[PDB]
Amino acid sequence: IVVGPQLKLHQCGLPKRMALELFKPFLLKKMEEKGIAPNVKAARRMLER
Amino acid sequence: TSVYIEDVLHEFSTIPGVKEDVVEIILNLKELVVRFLNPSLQTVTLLLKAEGPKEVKARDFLPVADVEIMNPDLHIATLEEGGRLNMEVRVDRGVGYVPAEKHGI
Amino acid sequence: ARTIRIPVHMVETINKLSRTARQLQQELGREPTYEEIAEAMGPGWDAKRVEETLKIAQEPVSLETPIGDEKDSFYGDFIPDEHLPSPVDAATQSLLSEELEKALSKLSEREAMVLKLRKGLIDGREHTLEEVGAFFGVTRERIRQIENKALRKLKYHESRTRKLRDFLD
Amino acid sequence: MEIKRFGRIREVIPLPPLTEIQVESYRRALQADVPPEKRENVGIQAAFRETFPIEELVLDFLEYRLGEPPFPQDECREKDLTYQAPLYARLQLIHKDTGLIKEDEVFLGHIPLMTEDGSFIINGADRVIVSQIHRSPGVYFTPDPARPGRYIASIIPLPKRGPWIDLEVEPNGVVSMKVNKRKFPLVLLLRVLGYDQETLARELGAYGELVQGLMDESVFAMRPEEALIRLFTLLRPGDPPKRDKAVAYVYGLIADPRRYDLGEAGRYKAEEKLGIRLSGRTLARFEDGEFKDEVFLPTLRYLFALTAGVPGHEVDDIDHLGNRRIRTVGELMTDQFRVGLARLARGVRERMLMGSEDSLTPAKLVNSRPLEAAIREFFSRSQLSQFKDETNPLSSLRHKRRISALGPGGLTRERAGFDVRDVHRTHYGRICPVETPEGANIGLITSLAAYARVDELGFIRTPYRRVVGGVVTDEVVYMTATEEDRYTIAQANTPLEGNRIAAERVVARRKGEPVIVSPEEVEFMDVSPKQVFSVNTNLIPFLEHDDANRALMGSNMQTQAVPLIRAQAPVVMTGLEERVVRDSLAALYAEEDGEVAKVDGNRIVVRYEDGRLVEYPLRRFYRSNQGTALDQRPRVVVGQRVRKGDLLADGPASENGFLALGQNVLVAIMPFDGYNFEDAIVISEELLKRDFYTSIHIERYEIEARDTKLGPERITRDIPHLSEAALRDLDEEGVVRIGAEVKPGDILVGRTSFKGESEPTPEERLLRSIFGEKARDVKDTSLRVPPGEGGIVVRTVRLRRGDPGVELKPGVREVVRVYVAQKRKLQVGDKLANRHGNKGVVAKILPVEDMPHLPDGTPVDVILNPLGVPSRMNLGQILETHLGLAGYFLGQRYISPIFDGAKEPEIKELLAQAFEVYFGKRKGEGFGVDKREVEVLRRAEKLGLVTPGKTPEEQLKELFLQGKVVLYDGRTGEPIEGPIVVGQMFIMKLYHMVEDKMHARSTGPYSLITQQPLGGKAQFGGQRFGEMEVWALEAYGAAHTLQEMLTLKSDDIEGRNAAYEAIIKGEDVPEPSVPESFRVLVKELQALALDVQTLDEKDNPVDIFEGLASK
DNA sequence: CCTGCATCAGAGCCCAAAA
DNA sequence: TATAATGGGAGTCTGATGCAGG
RNA sequence: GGGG
C-alpha cells in the first residue's frame, strides 16, 4: 500500500494488472459483447501472453 | 536510443580487452550530446572502431555530416593490448524523458 | 516394512545392490556410477537396469512432512489436485457439448442422428464395420458415406462458424 | 574528495578478524593441516578417541586423514554438489581370544569443507552455521522459590551427555537427590560411594541440624554393595537387580567418560567453584572394583555451608555471561559427528557376533552409512544450518556472527520467558544490545560484539587496557565476564594527556554498576566505544543521538540493502566501512607488491616482485541466494603501480573499498501535499533519469525431462498446436536463445509429455475428426514465465544423462536451467530507509519541474515528512543532514565515529565555510538578494530564527548555520513560507520491492483433501480469509458476502464451477451448495466411529452426498 | 473434611516458508 | 529345514480438575 | 531466521 491523497473517501487505487485477474471472468464476457475476441475461449487465450 | 556492439547479445555482457562492462559503456553513451545542424534530420547512426592500448573517447566516432559531437573529451572505454571494439549507436531527436522499456528501439 | 509392498525376492535383489555399492564406495573412496555397479553385479546387468531398480526401490514420503522451523506448514499444501476439473475446464466441457449439439442439427438432425450414433456424446460407441449393421435406417456400406457427408457438410459449415477452432488448444 | 575525520580516541587495537568465529572453530575441529601425531585431543580427533577401542574381539583406532576435495568451490555450486573432502580412518583389528591383527584404512564417506569466508556449500547452495548460546556445564546453586531459606544445587552437564540433577532439601530435613525427574534420599547414594556415617559427620557436621538430617540408619545397615542394589530397585522397577546389571546402569549414568560428559568448561567451573580438582569429566569413578566420589561430596559440602550463611558462598546468576557459553560451528558439527560414530559402533559390535569369529577384516566390519547420514543430516536439516544471507556483503558477514538461543539443545518459542531475553549487565562489550529481531524472537537471537572473541572454553571475551597507577598501558587483556567483575573499569572517553589519565574524576563501572572514582582507583579502561555494539550498529553515524528502538531498525535494515549499479559510500561514515569490505572477501586485494600487467572486464593479471604473473579472474554477474547480483569490477589500469594490500577490484555494494549500501541524495525535510503521509516518501524523477536506485536482479528457472511409464518427456522445439510467433526466440533444440527478451506467458524451455488414459474423450474425438488432425501422442508441458516475472535470458545450462560428468536422480533424463536477468528502476511501492530507522515506501515520483529547489536552481531529490522525527526520537538523521549540507558545497565526506564524533560547534564551523560557496559565488556573479528571500526572512524573524536588524546575508547565514535554506516551490514559484532543512543524506533501497510482492487470482490450483485454493504467490494461491476476517464480515452483517467466501470462492465444487460459468455468460452467480470441506469433516468423524446426521425440520435425515455413499 | 498433587490442554493474525 | 544359541536400549509455564492421604 |  501507498498513500493516495487525491482519492475521495470512498475510493482506492487498484493496479490495472491486479484488476484484470480479479475480474477475469467479467473481462472475458465483456470482451465478447463489444468485440475484442470472437468468443470466451479465444479471449482468455489472448490474456495469457 | 540504442546500441549494437559486435559479439554482444544483451546488456549484461562484458568485452575481452575492455575494462568497462557493457552496463557502464551504455551508461557513458547516455551522456553523449549530439547536435543536429539540419532541422529535418530525426535519426542517425554513429560508428566507432578502436583497438590497441587506447582510451576511447567520444571523438573516435566516425564523423557524419550535419552532426557535431559537443563533448569530444568524454571517456567511453579503456582498452588494453589486444582489446577490440566495433559498435553502432543510434541517436534520435525527441522530447522529455523516454525510458528504455517504453521505446524498445 | 514398505508402504508400497514389494515381492520378497525383489527386496532381496535391491538389498544386494546396496551391499554391492557399499563395497564399491569403500574401495573407490567416492560414490560409484550406475555403470560401476552394473559391472560389479555381473552379467545381465547394464547401467540402465541398475537405475530402473533404484526407481522401484524409492519409498514414499509423508504428506504431513513439516517445511520450516515454524511448526505451521505441510508439504501436502503445496500439491495441486489434478483430478477434479477446474472451473475453467468444467465450464469449457459444458460449452463444448453445447456447441457440438447446436452444430450437428444445423445441417440436418437425421444426418446428425446417423453421425451422433457413430461416436456417442456421453457413451463412446465407436466400433468399425460389423455392429453398424442394425438401426441407423439404411443397410450397411451407406452409413460410411453419410458419415462423410455429415463430416463434409460439417467441414464447410465449420469455416463460417469457426468458433470450434480454439477448442484444439 | 577530501575525507575529514573527527574524534580524539586512539584505538590501541584493530577489530579482530570478523569471520574468525567461523573459520577458527572449524579449522580447530578438522585439524586437516596438522600432522596426525601432533594433533591435540579435541574436535574430530577427540570423537574418535572417545568411541574407540570397541570391545566384544577389539577394534582399535590408529589415526584419520582428510583427502582433498573432488571438485573445487565454483564447480560444486554449479552442479548442485556438496563441497567436501573424503575421510579415511586407519583401524587395527585385534582378536581378544586369538592374537590375530589385521589393519586396513576404511572409507567413512565425505565431510563438508568450509570456504575462506566462513560459509559452506551444501547441495549447490551456500549455507551458514549459526552459533548457539546455552547454559555452561558446571555446578550451580540457585535459591529454592518455595522455601525462602533453602537452596537447590543443580549439576548440569553438556547437552545430551547426561542427566540434570537437583539436590533439594525436603521439609523432613534429609537432603534429597533428583535424577530423571525421580527423587530419593541422597544418603543412599553416598553409601554406594563407600561413605560411612563418620566421614559425613566429621567432614560436614558443623551445621548442627542439617548434617544430622541426612543421617539414616537403615541405609548404613549394609555394605557398599547392598546399598547399590537397594537404589537400583528405586530407579528401575520390574528389572531384576543383578549385580553386573546394576553396576552397568549406574556406571553408564554417573562414572562413564563415554555416557556422561561434563564440559571442559564444566571441569574448570566445577574446580573453581567448589575448590576441588577434577581428575576427569565424570561425576565419579570405577576404581579397584568399587566407586570413588569426586563431585558429590564437595557439592553437598557447598550446599550445607551456603544454607548456614558461611562466608565465601553465594548463589549463581544463571544469565551471567560467565556461566553462559557459546557453542560454535566445530562444536555443533562435532556433537553430530560423535552421534554418527557411536551408531557405526552398534554395527561393529553386532557384526562381531554373527558371521564367523575369524574371517573378518576392518574393511568388512565397518558400514559407514550411520556416520554419513548424521553429518548429512546436520548440514542439510539442522536448525542452525541456514541458507546464507548474501543480499550484500554485509548481509553474510552479520549472519555468521549471530548468536541463537533457539535450536536443538536450547529454548523453544513456547518454552521461553523474560530472564533470557533481557540485556544482562555482562553483555557489555560482548553481545550487542541493539541488534536483535523485533517481534517474537526479541532477545533470543543476538549479534557478536565487534571486539569480542570466543575463547577455547566457549565464553565470550572482550578487550580492556590495563591502568597502572594513573598511567594507561598499551597491553590489552581479553577478559571473561567472571574475571571482569573483579576490577574497576574506566570509560573509553575519559580525558587523557599523553598516556596519563587527565581527569580528577573518571566515569567507571564496578560489576556493571556505574560509579564515580578517582584516578588512583582505576584498574582497567574500555578500548573503544565500538567494542559495545555489533558490526551493523557500528555503521550508524551519530548513534549517540538515536533512540535505541529506532537504532535497531537501522542496524537490521543495512542487512537488507540491495546492491545498486551506481552504489556509493555515505558522505558521513563511522570509519568501519573500510574494514567490513575487506573482511567480507567481496572485493579483491594484491598479494605482494607489484605492477598491474593487464586489466579486463573478465580478469586482472598482476606482475609481482617475485616475477610470477598471478592471474585473478573476476566474478561477473553471479546470482546470490536472494537474487541480487554479486559482481566484481576492476579498479586499476594497465601499468598501475600497486603495493601489498591495495585494491584491485570492487565487490558488490562497495565503492573504492568502502561499504556502499545505497546512494547519497539531496533531501528536503518538509511535508508535501499528503504524499508524505505516515512515512511515505516522495522522490524526484531525476533519480530514475540518472539511474540512482537501479539494481540488477536474477531469477533462476529449472525444468527436468524424465522417464515415465507412459514414455519419455522430451525437450524439443516441436510443441503441438503452437504458432511460429510463439516459438521465435527458441533455438533448434527447444531452448530460448541467449539474449532474448522474455515476458509473462513466453516459453523458456519446450517440453512434451505423453498423454494419460484421458486419451481424448469421445467429445474430443469427434471434434478432432472434423478438422482432420490426428490427436497427437504428446501434450504441451513447456516451461513458461510466471505472472509478473521476466527479463533478458542471460545464460542456459543443459544437463542430460549420458554426458560426461553428469548423472541425475533416478528416472531423470535431463535437467535444463535458464537464468533470466532484469534491471530494476526505482518505482512506486519500492521501499527505502536510512541508517537511523526512518523507513518508508515511495508513494510519488514528481517530475523535476515540481520538485522544491534551491534559489540557484538545483532541485532536491527526496522529500521526507518531518512528522516522522519527533515521536521516533532518532535525531542522528538530522545531524547527518546538516553535516551533509556543508559537505555538498565544500565537496567533502566525513568520518564521524560513534560517541566520539563531530559535535555541534564543529559542524557549525563547517556549515559556515559552505555558505561562502553557496552565496559568495552569487555576490560575485552579479546577483543580489531575492525579493522572496526577504519575504521568508520577514517570517523568519517572527520565528526567532534570525536576529532582527541585520543584512540579508547576515540573516541567511544565521539560517544556514541552523541547517535551513530558502526553498522555492516548483509549482508556484513562490517561496516556502519558511526556511526548510536541506542536506545530503545516505538512503538505501531495501529488498522489499513491489515487483516481487504484487499478486492476484481469479481461480486456480486447489488442495487435495480440502479442495480449497492453495497458498502463496508461487503457487498462484488465493488469499487466506481467516477466523478474524470472518468476524469482520459477521460484525457488518454481510451474510451473502461471507457465504460467498465460504462456498463459491473456495471449496464448494458444484457452486464454484457453476459460478464461473455464470459470469462468462452474463448471468448472476447461483445460490451456493454444501462446501466440500464439510463433507470431509463428516467422513472424518465417521472414521472415528461417530454418526453425524444432517436433519430437516421434521427430524428426518437429509442426504448431503446426493445418493453417492449409500447402497 | 480438606488439601496437596498430577495429568492435561491451552498459549494472536496475514505474508514470504528458499524444501 | 538340525553344533548350540533362552528377559530391551533411551528424553517450559500457565490455570482447571479429578485423585488418594494427614 | 525475514515483512507489517
Ligand SMILES: Nc1nc2c(ncn2[C@@H]2O[C@H](COP(=O)(O)OP(=O)(O)OP(=O)(O)O)[C@@H](O)[C@H]2O)c(=O)[nH]1
Ligand atoms: N498483530 C501484529 N501486528 C503487527 C505485527 N508486526 C507489525 N504489526 C503492525 O505494526 C504496527 C505498528 O505500528 P507503529 O508504527 O508502531 O504505530 P504507532 O503507534 O503510530 O507508532 P509510531 O509510528 O512510531 O508513532 C501495528 O499497527 C501492527 O498491526 C505482528 O507481528 N503482529
